[PDB]
A paper describes a structure:
In response to environmental stimuli, the bacterium produces and secretes its main virulence factor, the cholera toxin (CT). CT is an AB5 protein toxin, which consists of one toxic A-subunit (CTA) and five identical B-subunits arranged in a doughnut-shaped ring (CTB). The primary receptor of the cholera toxin is the GM1 ganglioside, which is expressed in distinct membrane microdomains of small-intestinal epithelial cells.
Moreover, no previous toxin structure has been reported in complex with the blood group H determinant, which is characteristic of blood group O. The crystal structures of the cCTB and ET CTB complexes were determined to a resolution of 1.1 Å and 1.5 Å, respectively. Well-defined electron density is present in all ten binding sites of the two pentamers, although the ligand orientations differ. While the electron density of the cCTB structure primarily supports orientation 2, most ET CTB binding sites exhibit the ligand in orientation 1. Since H-tetra-BGA is an almost symmetrical molecule, the fucosyl residues are indistinguishable. As for the complexes with A-penta-BGA, the fucose near residue 47 is most tightly anchored to the toxin, while the other fucose is loosely bound, by indirect water-mediated interactions. In general, the two structures are very similar, except that the N-acetyl group changes place in the two different orientations; the axial 4-OH group of Gal is mimicked by the α-anomer of GlcNAc. In orientation 1, the N-acetyl group takes the position of the GalNAc residue characterizing A-penta-BGA.
Residue numbers in the entry:
A (entry chain A), B (entry chain E), C (entry chain D), D (entry chain C), E (entry chain B): 1 to 103
Write the structure that this text describes.
């Protein structure tokens, strides 16, 4: 079991760490059908998504996707500094797999 | 996959973007039978709804509908600026499909 | 679709609008068996309940009842001004069907 | 139906009202097998639990028990004054049935 | 029934009390398949996890695991002081069983 986000992200061939060290600039969410997703941005121009759930996810992933959307919303509204994101960089915009917050 | 609210909105028929750049003026919610909805207003007189779940929603949007009302409530209570709403403009009040918050 | 709490409330028998224009004075909640409810009071003496879920309710109201107790708790804790309540006046205390909040 | 926590408590055997008029001094929660509970304390030395779900609880209480833990946590973190607790006094620590907040 | 976290922790083997008396330095959360977990750190170098849910957790702990991650996120965002953690010291990093928070 990894002990930080960088070592977690290393376990997935399909991933990359972004180091932001900045609050979320905008939060977007959608209830439109097949686009039940969130999108966040940073002042540096980075855009990331929390993906729509699909067959790419086992049951535990579904719950954690909902959690991540909860986390990004409150992080936005509290101006919490996001340290790093672990993202899938094959998806466009890059999909969030993990988040670290420190400040 | 859309990278922003406007791209997302532009995916659907009978939608438009409202650019509010303002906090929500009022928040209403009902648990009355057949009217399990929310209504928000802005100072400019704009009124929007999160629709009652009916036939026009696939069962997967049900969770996103619940999340949207949670988002609107906490946005209202934190006085968070709403940047844009993507709405079905053929409903009265116009029906919320997506939201972005910035600044 | 109604555009406001007053018009929504008018769609049901045995309801009326109370116009409080005030913060909730007290918030009570119970997990006791057959009393799984919330009660709020206002400085003016008004007492209102969120009713225990039951036969009088329909399936789509279940989630909305829970949402309403969520809303009253966080309204209480943020000292949010309650504009209006739509309530059933054939219950004691009168039973909340909808709420609006405005600055 | 009761109109306040004192009348509510009187409906049950083995209960009594604790009048605290004070914030929660500490909040503990456990995910440990068979001790999935919350414990709260007050500065005066009072200690109270939200019981582990069990055969003393009917199905309608399950969501209420989870709600009460949500309530205690947020009350703790907001330093919200707890007026009264309705508790079962045939358990150690006494087991919360109902909470009233006012300040 | 335990009245505090220390007496609670003693009911289990391979569990130990860590007294932090400090706020959470960093909060990490992941939705990656098979790593649906939270990691928290403290300034003193201590690292703790909420475990990915698994065959080692009984049914009554599944809800409590999701709650704990909720509790840790909100604790991090409010800079709440963690008094003690009860953890399984046979996991790497050590896995949270319970938390106490006090002023
Ligand atoms: C090459 C790489 O490692 N990643 C790129 C990413 O660039 C990275 O992130 C940006 C913000 C900056 O820190 C770069 O130095 C860094 O390599 C690209 O990001 C785009 O950057 C431009 C710069 O102004 C715009 O801001 C653009 O909107 C950014 O793309 C968005 O954000 C990304 C994280 C992706 O999710 C992308 O799909 C978004 O449109 C992108 C460009 O495709 O490609 C890698 O992510
Ligand atoms: C309380 C009231 O009567 N408000 C109207 C407002 O209509 C409300 O809000 C709109 C968005 C819609 O959801 C209505 O069903 C609801 O009553 C009017 O806004 C216009 O409404 C029409 C037809 O719905 C179009 O939506 C039009 O785009 C709206 O005007 C735009 O939004 C306004 C708030 C202004 O920013 C205006 O400049 C925009 O063009 C307004 C018309 O001013 O009248 C009341 O506020
Ligand atoms: C009227 C009377 O004699 N009450 C006691 C009560 O103590 C009183 O109330 C408590 C909260 C505290 O302020 C006491 O100082 C006060 O005298 C007993 O509560 C325990 O009291 C001792 C101190 O005497 C400790 O403070 C202890 O933590 C208290 O018990 C805990 O909290 C209680 C509310 C119960 O949930 C109990 O199970 C916990 O262990 C109680 C309990 O024996 O007995 C009378 O009510
Ligand atoms: C990032 C890093 O290298 N941290 C170590 C820290 O270990 C981490 O945190 C502990 C709680 C545990 O979850 C580890 O699995 C995790 O990597 C070290 O902490 C000690 O770790 C061992 C187990 O490896 C025991 O848990 C031991 O009790 C821990 O020491 C206590 O906590 C420390 C932070 C100090 O307060 C120490 O005085 C305590 O005894 C520490 C020390 O080895 O070093 C890094 O911080
Ligand atoms: C216009 C009128 O006569 N209305 C009464 C209610 O009395 C009015 O509203 C109260 C909230 C007070 O502001 C009162 O001064 C005002 O005239 C009456 O409510 C009760 O009033 C008594 C005091 O006389 C207490 O305040 C009591 O708590 C009130 O009742 C509770 O709150 C209500 C809104 C309902 O939910 C009741 O079920 C509660 O018990 C009501 C009920 O007697 O009757 C109207 O006709
Ligand atoms: Ca700011
Ligand atoms: Ca801070
Ligand atoms: Ca203001
Ligand atoms: Ca701000
Ligand atoms: Ca005040
Ligand atoms: Ca305000
Ligand atoms: Ca204080
Ligand atoms: Ca206050
Ligand atoms: Ca600080
Ligand atoms: Ca404090």
């Amino acid at each position: 079991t990894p002990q930080n986000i960088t070592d977690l992200c290393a376990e997935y061939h399909n991933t990359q760490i972004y180091t932001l060290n900045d609050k979320i600039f905008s939060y977007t969410e959608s209830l439109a059908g097949k686009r039940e997703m969130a999108i966040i941005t940073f002042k540096n121009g980075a855009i990331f998504q929390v993906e729509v759930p699909g067959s790419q996810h086992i049951d535990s992933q579904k719950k954690a996707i909902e959690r991540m959307k909860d986390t990004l919303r409150i992080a936005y509204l509290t101006e919490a500094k996001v340290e790093k994101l672990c993202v899938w960089n094959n998806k466009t915009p890059h999909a969030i797999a993990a988040i670290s917050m420190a400040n």
